[PDB]
Amino acid sequence: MNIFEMLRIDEGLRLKIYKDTEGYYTIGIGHLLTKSPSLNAAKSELDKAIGRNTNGVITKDEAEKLFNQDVDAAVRGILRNAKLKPVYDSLDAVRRAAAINMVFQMGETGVAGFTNSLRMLQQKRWDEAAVNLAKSRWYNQTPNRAKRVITTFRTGTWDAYK
Ligand SMILES: Fc1c(F)c(F)c(I)c(F)c1F
């Protein structure tokens, strides 16, 4: 198991434009295209991302290309953030994957609300952190995924992903 296999499980793989859990146009392995309700706007974002006129369909290779870029971008974003970098650096590699997973899903807009969780994670108060993480819109809207990510933070194992 690793961050790629982990996010592949959590995001799935779809080669045509679909709406994510929040109703936003998405493609591939959870590559958010736009929050705009316009399918045409979404198709434009896709074409821009892939570098060709796609008409809303991509290949597995192209999906994997975007995915690698997205994971890379998520990690790079963590390291460039003053409030995130020290917590990330404090973690072991398994829990770092759990951090990347959350950033991938919600971005730094969504991660901003998790200040108290981050503090408990840096303190290595794993059970307390796990309890705090669940007290969130995130947990309530995507409980099965959140439970997997939280278990990963609680245990520092891949048990929730087999
Ligand atoms: F740096 C970090 C993040 F950006 C993050 F989202 C989470 I959840 C973390 F647990 C973390 F350590």
The response to whether 132 counts as a known ligand-binding position is yes
The response to whether 40 counts as a known ligand-binding position is no
Tokens of 122: 């840096």
CA angle 102, 104, 106 (to 5 degrees): 65
Say which residue the tokens 């840096």 belong to.
Answer: 122
**Ligand 1 pocket test target in 6, 79, 84 with most atoms within 8 Å of CB:** 84
Question: Which of these is catalytic: 5, 10, 20, 128?
Answer: 20
Spatial separation of the C-alpha atoms in residues 155 and 162, rounded to whole Å:
13
Work out the angle between the directed axes of helices 115-122 and 126-134 (0-180°, nearest 10): 170
Three-state DSSP class for 32?
strand
Question: Which of these is catalytic: 10, 11, 45, 62?
Answer: 11
Nearest CA-CA partner of 122 in 93, 95, 87: 87
Q: What is the resolution in angstroms?
A: 1.8
Question: Which residue(s) pair with 116 in the sheet?
Answer: none
DSSP class of residue 156 equals S
Question: Which residue(s) pair with 27 in the sheet?
Answer: 31
Spatial separation of the C-alpha atoms in residues 45 and 130, rounded to whole Å:
36
Contact 152, 95 (CB under 8 A): yes
Q: How was this structure determined?
A: X-ray
Q: How many CB atoms lie within 10 A of CB 91?
A: 17
The response to whether 67 counts as a known ligand-binding position is no
Residue 106 CB less than 6 A away from ligand 1: no
**Number of helices and strands in the chain (H, E):** 9, 3
- The architecture in CATH of the region 1-162 reads Orthogonal Bundle (1.10)
Tokens of 96: 């770092």
- Specify the long-range contacts of residues 42-45, CB closer than 8 Å, at least 24 apart: 42/17, 43/17
Side chain identity at residue 138, one-letter code: W
CA 27 to chain centroid, in Å, comes to 14
Spatial separation of the C-alpha atoms in residues 73 and 76, rounded to whole Å:
5
Atom of ligand 1 nearest to the CA of 122: 12
Spatial separation of the C-alpha atoms in residues 63 and 105, rounded to whole Å:
16
User: By 3-state DSSP, what share of the chain in percent is helix, strand and coil, each rounded to 5?
Assistant: 65, 10, 25
